[PDB]
């Protein structure tokens, strides 16, 4: 399959940069699949685990909170407020926040706390989902 110059960057620093056969990042609410040779596209990147496929039949899963996704003819750049490598994603950290929301949700008293706990649960669940998939990938 063809190859494209994909580069993932975040507010902390770059995460990926090289050749890719195909990448899939969540944008505009739906899953946008870019292929080597696609036309220029600019869509908002929403929270979701983007996958970067290489020419070696491999794929790299990365978690992005959401930001800006700029697609170029032979180049691809996805800016995310926060990018975490599937191999770097800390399960311990996510487990802490994941349980914090679960216990905070059941003890919901107002709408403010709920909005925060819920947002944390969904976010934490995303990071874990990205890891579990990479570390295992047996679905």
Residue 96's Cβ-count burial label (10 Å; 0-12, 13-18, 19+) is exposed
In which element (H, E) is residue 75 found? strand 75-80
Q: Which two tokens stand for residue 121?
A: 């649960």
Tokens 């994909």 sit on residue? 6
- Cα–Cα dist 90/99, whole Å: 14
- Within 10 A of 44 (CB to CB), how many other CB atoms are there? 11
- Cα–Cα dist 64/84, whole Å: 7
Experimental method: NMR
Question: φ, ψ for residue 81 (rounded to 5)?
Answer: -50, -30
Tokens 């996958």 sit on residue? 51
Please, are residues 48 and 126 in contact by the beta-carbon 8 Å criterion? yes
Tokens 């003890």 sit on residue? 107
Residue range 4-85 forms a domain whose CATH class is: mainly beta
* Domain regions of the chain by residue span: 4-85, 91-135
């Amino acid at each position: 399959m063809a190859t494209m110059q994909c580069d993932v960057v975040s507010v902390k620093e770059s995460i990926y940069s090289g050749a890719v056969t195909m990448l899939i990042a969540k944008g505009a609410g739906g899953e946008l699949g870019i292929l080597p040779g696609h036309a220029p596209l600019v869509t908002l990147l929403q929270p979701g685990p983007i996958r970067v496929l290489l020419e070696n039949g491999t794929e790299e899963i990365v978690y992005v909170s959401g930001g800006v996704l700029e697609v170029q003819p032979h180049v691809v750049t996805v800016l995310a407020d926060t990018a975490i490598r599937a191999d770097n994603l800390d399960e311990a950290a996510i487990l802490e926040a994941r349980k914090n929301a679960e216990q905070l949700l059941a003890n919901q008293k107002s709408d403010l706390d709920s909005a925060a706990a819920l947002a944390a649960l969904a976010e934490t669940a995303a990071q874990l989902e990205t890891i579990r998939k990479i570390k295992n990938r047996a679905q």
